[PDB]
Each structure stands twice: as C-alpha cells, then as structure tokens.
Short mmCIF file of C-alpha atoms and ligand atoms in Angstrom, two decimals:
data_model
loop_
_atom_site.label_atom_id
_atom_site.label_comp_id
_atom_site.label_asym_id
_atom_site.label_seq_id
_atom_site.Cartn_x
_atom_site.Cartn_y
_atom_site.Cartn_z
CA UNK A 1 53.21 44.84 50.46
CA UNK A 2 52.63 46.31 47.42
CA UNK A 3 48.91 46.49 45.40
CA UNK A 4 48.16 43.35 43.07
CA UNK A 5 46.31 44.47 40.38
CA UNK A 6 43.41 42.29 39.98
CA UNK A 7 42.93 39.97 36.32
CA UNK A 8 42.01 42.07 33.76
CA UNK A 9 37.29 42.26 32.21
CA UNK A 10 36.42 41.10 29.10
CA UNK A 11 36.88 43.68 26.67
CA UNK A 12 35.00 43.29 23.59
CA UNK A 13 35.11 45.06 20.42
CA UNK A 14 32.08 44.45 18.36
CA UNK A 15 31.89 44.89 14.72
CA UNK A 16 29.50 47.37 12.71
CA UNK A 17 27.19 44.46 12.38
CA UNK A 18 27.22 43.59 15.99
CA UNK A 19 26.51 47.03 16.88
CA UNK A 20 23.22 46.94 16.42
CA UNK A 21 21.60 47.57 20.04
CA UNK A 22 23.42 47.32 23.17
CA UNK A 23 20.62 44.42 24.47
CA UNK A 24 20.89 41.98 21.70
CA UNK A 25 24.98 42.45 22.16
CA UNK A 26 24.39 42.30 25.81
CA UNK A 27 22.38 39.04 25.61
CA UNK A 28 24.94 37.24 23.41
CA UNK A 29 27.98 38.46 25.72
CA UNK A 30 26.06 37.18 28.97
CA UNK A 31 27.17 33.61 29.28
CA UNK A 32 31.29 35.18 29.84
CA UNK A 33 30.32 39.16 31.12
CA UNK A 34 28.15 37.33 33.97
CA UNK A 35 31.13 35.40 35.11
CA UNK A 36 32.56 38.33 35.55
CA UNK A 37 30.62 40.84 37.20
CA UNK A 38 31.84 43.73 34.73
CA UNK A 39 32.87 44.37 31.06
CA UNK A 40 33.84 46.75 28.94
CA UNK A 41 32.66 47.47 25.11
CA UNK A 42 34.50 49.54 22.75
CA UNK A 43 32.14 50.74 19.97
CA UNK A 44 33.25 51.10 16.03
CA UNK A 45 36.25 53.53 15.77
CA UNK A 46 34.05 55.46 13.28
CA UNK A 47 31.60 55.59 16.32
CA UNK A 48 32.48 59.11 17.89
CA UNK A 49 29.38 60.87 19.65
CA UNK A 50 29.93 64.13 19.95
CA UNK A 51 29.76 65.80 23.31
CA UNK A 52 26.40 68.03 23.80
CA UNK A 53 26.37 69.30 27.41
CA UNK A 54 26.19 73.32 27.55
CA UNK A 55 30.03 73.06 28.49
CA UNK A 56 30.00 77.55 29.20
CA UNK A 57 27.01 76.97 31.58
CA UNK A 58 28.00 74.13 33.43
CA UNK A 59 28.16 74.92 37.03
CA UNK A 60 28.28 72.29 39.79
CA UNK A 61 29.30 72.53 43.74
CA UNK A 62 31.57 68.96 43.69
CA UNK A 63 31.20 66.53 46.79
CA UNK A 64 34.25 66.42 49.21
CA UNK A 65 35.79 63.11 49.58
CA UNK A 66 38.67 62.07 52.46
CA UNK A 67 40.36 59.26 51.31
CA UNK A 68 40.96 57.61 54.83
CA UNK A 69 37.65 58.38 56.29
CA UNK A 70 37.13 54.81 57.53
CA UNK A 71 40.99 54.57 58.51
CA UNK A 72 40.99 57.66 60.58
CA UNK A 73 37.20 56.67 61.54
CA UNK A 74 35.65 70.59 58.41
CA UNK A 75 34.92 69.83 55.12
CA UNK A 76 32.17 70.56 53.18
CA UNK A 77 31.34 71.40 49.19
CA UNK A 78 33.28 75.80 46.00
CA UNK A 79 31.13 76.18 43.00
CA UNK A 80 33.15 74.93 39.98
CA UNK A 81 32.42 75.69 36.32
CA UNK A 82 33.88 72.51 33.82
CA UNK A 83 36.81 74.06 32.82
CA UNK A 84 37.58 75.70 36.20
CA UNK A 85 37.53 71.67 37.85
CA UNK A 86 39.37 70.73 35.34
CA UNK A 87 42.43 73.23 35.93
CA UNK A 88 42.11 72.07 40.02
CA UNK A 89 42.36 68.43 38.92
CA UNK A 90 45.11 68.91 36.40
CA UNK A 91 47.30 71.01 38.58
CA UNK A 92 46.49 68.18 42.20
CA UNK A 93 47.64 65.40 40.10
CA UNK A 94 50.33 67.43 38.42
CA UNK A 95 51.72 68.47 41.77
CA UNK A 96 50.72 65.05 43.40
CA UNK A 97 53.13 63.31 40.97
CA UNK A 98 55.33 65.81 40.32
CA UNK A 99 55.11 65.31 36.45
CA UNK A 100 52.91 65.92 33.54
CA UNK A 101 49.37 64.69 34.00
CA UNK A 102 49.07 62.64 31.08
CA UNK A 103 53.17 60.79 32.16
CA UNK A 104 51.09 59.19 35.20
CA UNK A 105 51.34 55.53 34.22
CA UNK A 106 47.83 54.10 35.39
CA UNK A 107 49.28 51.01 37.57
CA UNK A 108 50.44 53.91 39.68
CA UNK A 109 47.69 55.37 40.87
CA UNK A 110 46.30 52.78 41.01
CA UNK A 111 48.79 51.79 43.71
CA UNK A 112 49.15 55.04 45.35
CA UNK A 113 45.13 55.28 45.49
CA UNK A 114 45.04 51.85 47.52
CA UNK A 115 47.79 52.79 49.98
CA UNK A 116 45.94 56.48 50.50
CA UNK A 117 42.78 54.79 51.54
CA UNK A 118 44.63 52.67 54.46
CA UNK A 119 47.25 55.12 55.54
CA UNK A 120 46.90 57.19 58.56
CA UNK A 121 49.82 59.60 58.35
CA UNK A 122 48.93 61.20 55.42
CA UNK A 123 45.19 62.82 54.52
CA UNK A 124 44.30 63.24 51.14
CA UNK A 125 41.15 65.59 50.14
CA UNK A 126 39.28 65.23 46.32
CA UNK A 127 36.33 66.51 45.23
CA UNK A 128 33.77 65.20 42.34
CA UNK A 129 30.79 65.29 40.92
CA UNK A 130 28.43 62.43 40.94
CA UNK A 131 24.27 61.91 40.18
CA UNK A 132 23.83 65.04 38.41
CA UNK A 133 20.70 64.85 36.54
CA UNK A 134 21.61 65.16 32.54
CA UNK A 135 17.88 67.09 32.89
CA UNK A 136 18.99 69.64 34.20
CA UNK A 137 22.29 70.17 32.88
CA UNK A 138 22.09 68.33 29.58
CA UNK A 139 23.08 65.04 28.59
CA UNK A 140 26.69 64.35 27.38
CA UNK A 141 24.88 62.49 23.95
CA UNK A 142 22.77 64.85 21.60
CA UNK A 143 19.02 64.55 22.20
CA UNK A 144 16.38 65.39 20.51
CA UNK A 145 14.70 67.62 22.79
CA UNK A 146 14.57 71.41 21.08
CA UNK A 147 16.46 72.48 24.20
CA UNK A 148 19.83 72.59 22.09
CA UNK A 149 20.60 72.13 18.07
CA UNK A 150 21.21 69.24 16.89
CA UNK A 151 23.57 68.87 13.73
CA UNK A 152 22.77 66.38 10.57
CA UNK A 153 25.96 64.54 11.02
CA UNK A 154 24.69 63.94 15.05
CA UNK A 155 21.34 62.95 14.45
CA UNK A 156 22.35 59.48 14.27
CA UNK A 157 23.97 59.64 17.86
CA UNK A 158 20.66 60.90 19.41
CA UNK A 159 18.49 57.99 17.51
CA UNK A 160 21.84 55.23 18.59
CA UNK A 161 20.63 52.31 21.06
CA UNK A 162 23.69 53.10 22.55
CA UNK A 163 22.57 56.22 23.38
CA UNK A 164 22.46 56.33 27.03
CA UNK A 165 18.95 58.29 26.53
CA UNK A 166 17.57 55.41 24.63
CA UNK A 167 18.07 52.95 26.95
CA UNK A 168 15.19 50.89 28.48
CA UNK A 169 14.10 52.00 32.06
CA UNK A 170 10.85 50.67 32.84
CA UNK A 171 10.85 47.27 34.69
CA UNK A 172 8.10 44.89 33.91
CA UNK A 173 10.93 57.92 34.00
CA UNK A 174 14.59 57.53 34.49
CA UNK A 175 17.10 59.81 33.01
CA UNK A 176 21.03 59.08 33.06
CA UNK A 177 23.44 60.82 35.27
CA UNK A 178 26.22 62.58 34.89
CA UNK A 179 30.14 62.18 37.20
CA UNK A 180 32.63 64.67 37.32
CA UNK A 181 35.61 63.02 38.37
CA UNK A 182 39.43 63.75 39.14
CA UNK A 183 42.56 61.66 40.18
CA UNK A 184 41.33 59.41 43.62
CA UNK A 185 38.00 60.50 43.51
CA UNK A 186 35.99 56.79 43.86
CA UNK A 187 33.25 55.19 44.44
CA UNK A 188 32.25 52.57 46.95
CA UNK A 189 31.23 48.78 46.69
CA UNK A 190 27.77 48.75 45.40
CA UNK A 191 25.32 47.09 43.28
CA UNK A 192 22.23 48.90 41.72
CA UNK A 193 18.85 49.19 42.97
CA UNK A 194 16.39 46.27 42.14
CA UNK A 195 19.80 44.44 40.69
CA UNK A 196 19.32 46.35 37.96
CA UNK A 197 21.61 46.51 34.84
CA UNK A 198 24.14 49.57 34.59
CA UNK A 199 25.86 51.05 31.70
CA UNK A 200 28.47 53.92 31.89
CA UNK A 201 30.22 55.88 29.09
CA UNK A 202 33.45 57.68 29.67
CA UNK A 203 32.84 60.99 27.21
CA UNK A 204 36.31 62.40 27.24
CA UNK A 205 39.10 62.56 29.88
CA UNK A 206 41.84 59.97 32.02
CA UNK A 207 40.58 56.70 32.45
CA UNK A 208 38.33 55.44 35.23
CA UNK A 209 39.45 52.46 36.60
CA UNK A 210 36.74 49.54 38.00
CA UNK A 211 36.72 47.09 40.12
CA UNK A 212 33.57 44.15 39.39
CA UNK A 213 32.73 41.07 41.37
CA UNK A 214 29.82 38.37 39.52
CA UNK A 215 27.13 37.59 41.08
CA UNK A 216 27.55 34.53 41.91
CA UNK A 217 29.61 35.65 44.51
CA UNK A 218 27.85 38.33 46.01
CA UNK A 219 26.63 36.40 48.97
CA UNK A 220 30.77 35.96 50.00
CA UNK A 221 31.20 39.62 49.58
CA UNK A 222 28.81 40.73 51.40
CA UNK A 223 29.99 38.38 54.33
CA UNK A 224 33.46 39.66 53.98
CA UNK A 225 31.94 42.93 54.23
CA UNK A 226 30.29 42.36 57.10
CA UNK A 227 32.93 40.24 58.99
CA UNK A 228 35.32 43.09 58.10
CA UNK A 229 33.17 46.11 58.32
CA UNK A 230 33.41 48.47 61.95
CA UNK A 231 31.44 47.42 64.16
CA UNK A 232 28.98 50.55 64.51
CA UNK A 233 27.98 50.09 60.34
CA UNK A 234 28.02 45.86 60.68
CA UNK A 235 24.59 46.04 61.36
CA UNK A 236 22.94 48.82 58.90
CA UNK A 237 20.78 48.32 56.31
CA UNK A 238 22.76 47.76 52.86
CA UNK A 239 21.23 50.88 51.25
CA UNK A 240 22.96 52.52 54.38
CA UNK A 241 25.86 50.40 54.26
CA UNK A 242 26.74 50.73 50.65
CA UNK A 243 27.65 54.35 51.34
CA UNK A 244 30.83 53.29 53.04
CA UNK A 245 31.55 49.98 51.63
CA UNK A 246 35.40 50.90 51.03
CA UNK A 247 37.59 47.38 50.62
CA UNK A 248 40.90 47.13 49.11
CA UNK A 249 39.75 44.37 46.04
CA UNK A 250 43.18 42.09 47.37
CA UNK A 251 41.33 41.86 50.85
CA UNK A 252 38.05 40.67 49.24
CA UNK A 253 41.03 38.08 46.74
CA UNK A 254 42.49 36.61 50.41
CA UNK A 255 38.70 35.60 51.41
CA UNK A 256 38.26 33.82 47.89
CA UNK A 257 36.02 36.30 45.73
CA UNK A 258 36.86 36.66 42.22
CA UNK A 259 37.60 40.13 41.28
CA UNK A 260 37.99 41.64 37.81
CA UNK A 261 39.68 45.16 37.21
CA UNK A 262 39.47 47.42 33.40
CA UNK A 263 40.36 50.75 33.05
CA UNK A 264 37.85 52.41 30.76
CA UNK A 265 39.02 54.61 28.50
CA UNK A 266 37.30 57.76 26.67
CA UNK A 267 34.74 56.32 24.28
CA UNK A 268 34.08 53.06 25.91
CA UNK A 269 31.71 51.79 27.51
CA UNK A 270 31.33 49.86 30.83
CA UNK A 271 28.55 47.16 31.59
CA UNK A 272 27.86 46.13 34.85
CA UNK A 273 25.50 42.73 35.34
CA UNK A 274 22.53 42.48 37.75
CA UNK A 275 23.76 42.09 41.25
CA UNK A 276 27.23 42.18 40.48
CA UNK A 277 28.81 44.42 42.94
CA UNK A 278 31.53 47.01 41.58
CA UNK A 279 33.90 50.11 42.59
CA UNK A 280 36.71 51.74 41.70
CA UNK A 281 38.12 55.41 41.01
CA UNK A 282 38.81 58.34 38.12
CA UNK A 283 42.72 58.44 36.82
CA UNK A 284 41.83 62.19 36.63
CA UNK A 285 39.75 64.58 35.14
CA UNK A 286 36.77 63.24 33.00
CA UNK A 287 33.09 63.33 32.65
CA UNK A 288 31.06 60.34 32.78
CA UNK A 289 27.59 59.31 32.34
CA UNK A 290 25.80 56.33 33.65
CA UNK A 291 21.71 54.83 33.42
CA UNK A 292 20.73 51.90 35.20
CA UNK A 293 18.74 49.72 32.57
CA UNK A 294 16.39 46.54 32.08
CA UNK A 295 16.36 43.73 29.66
C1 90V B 1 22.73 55.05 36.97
C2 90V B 1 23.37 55.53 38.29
C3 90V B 1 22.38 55.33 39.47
C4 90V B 1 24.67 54.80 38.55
C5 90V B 1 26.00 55.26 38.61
C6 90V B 1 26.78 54.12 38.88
C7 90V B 1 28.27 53.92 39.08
O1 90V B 1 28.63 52.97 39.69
N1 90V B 1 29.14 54.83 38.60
C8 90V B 1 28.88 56.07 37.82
C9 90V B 1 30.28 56.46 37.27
C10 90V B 1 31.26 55.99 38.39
N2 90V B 1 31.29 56.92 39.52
C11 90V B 1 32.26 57.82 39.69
O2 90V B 1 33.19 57.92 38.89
C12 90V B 1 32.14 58.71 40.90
C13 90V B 1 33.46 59.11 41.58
C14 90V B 1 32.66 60.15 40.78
C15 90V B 1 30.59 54.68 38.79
N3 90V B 1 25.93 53.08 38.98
N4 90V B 1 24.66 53.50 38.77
MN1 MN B 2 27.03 51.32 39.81
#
C-alpha cells in the first residue's frame, strides 16, 4: 500500500495592503488556519529578503539521522561548511534517484521517505542541521546589529514585521534558529513549548514538506501516540517523548485525526497554531529559519 498524501493547508497570498504585520494577518486568518493546525503564507512577489548569513564562514558539525531507528529499535556527527553540505546533499539525492536533483517530483519522496522510515531491509543515513542559534552564526534576514553591512535597498527587510528578528517573544530574549536540511532529513511530531506560536521561512533551496494536525485534536493524537508508541517510551514525559514521536500521518488518518500536508517553497512562510502538533521532512538541500512567537 502505497502513501496517501494527506489534503492539502491553506495557502494564502496576501496583498501589499494585507502585509502589514504578520499578527494582524495572523489574527484575521485564525478562524480557518486553526482548523487546520498549519498554513502557509506567501508574501508579495516584490517581497524578496535578501539572504545575510556569513555564507564563507559558515561551519556546522550536522546531526546524524537513521531513518528506521524506531523500526530497527556507530554513528555520530564531519564538520561541513554551506557549500560543502550542499554538494553531499546534491550528489545523495542525485545518486538516490538516479536523476537530476531538481527532476525529483515531490510526491516521490514524499513516498519513498514514508516507506524508508518503516522498512527494515534497507538503512538509510542523513545528516542536518537544526537549532543553530542565528547569534552566533547570523541570521538568514539582515539585522541591524553593526556585526555585518547592511545595504539601503535591505534596510526595509531588517525593519519588516515579517522579519523573523522582529517577531514578539516575550509572553505576558529569544532569537530564531536556523535548519540545515537535505533530502529525508525530518523532524518528529511536536508542538512548541508553552503552545506557543511558530513561524518558519524557507530562505532558498528544495521544498520542505509539513505535516500539521489542529488543536482540537491534539488530545486523539497524543492517544494514538501513546496506544501506538513502544512500550519502553509509552510512559515518558512528552518533552522526552517528542524526541521520537515518528508516525506515518495515514496511521494517525485510520484513528480519525485530521491531517493537513504543504510543501513550502523558498520564500514562504509556514505558520504553525498554538498546540497544533506538526512534522514533516526537507525535499533536499535548503536553509531554514524558525522563532517561536506570542500574540
Ligand atoms: C523556534 C524553534 C524552537 C522551532 C523549530 C521548529 C520546527 O518545527 N521546525 C524548524 C524547521 C523544520 N525542521 C527541520 O527542517 C529539521 C530537519 C532539519 C521544522 N519549531 N520550533
Ligand atoms: Mn515546530
């Protein structure tokens, strides 16, 4: 049996007027986003941010991921520059697929991604990067922060409310995170700390495909989870818990949860709702970056 992809987000494309801040848009988008867990906003085609990390400098040691860890039930983290990663994704998926990188059609990966996770004859090995600090390294948006220049033409991307950096963090200190990611590289089930808000822009690169569930049905998740879940991790805490929280979405579909899928493209954004638990999994190489936020 073959992957069923799941119904497709709302995708909204906002006018120059509606543009204005992402909490406003946000707030007039709840009453449909919140019924489903996740959206995704594409900004103003005039609205292109241009990328500001210290790409010659950038030096990370990516996380090793087994894609049938919890199947199978050694390896450990080579230091990578940006453009050195991006040559070991290109050529994995490239010689995964046996065809151009960019002739990959999405629903296929997709597929084979799914059947990876659950197969036991056959062990696949990514790598990533994920939560590093844009304070150390830079954030992807310009900033006005002395540390790098910052051009006339982008000074209006480092004052934009859509600015990850300009988002609000304090609850009634924070600084957004960066993702290096490559084909199959994913991330578990999850929601955010405190049921916070999230908000992720895709700077440049293959898609990233998600995977949202509302809130409403959170409480059946996590019972699927559970009822589904080894026994040894049934009973950990869900901070714990949420580390390996690995479900194909049509299992969590046959138990009655409503699950929405999008493939975010570069230059869009990705809004995920308080308590609305989401996963999914990088098309290929591309850099992402991601604040948890409060309205
Ligand atoms: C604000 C911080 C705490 C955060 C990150 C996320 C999240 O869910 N993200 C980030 C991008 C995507 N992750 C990846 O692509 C991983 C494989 C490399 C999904 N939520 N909050
Ligand atoms: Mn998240």
């Amino acid at each position: 049996a073959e992957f069923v992809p799941p119904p497709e987000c709302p995708v909204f494309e906002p006018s120059w007027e509606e543009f204005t801040d992402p909490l406003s848009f946000i707030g007039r988008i709840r009453p449909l986003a919140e019924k489903t867990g996740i959206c995704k906003i594409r900004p103003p085609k005039d609205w292109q941010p241009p990328f500001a990390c210290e790409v010659k400098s950038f030096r990370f040691t990516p996380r090793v991921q087994r894609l049938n860890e919890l199947e199978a039930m050694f390896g450990f983290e080579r230091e990578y520059t940006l453009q050195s990663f991006g040559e070991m994704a290109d050529n994995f998926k490239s010689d995964y697929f046996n065809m151009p990188v960019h002739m990959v059609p999405t629903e296929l990966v997709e597929k084979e991604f799914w059947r990876l996770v659950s197969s036991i004859e056959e062990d696949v090995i990514v790598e990533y990067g994920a939560d590093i600090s844009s304070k150390d390294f830079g954030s992807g948006f310009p900033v006005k922060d002395g540390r790098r220049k910052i051009l006339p033409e982008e000074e209006e991307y480092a004052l934009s409310g859509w600015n990850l950096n300009n988002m609000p963090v304090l609850e009634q200190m924070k600084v957004p995170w960066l993702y290096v990611g490559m084909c199959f590289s994913s991330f578990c089930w999850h929601i955010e700390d405190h049921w916070s808000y999230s908000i992720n822009y895709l700077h440049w690169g293959e898609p990233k495909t998600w995977y949202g569930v509302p809130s409403h049905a959170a409480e059946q998740l996590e019972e699927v989870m559970r009822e589904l879940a080894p026994e040894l991790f049934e009973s950990q805490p869900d901070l714990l818990h949420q580390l390996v929280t690995i479900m194909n979405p049509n299992v969590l579909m046959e138990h009655g949860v409503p699950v929405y899928r999008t493939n975010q493209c570069a230059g869009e954004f990705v809004v995920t709702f308080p308590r609305a638990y989401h996963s999914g999994f990088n098309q290929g190489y591309n850099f992402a970056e991601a604040v948890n936020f409060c309205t």
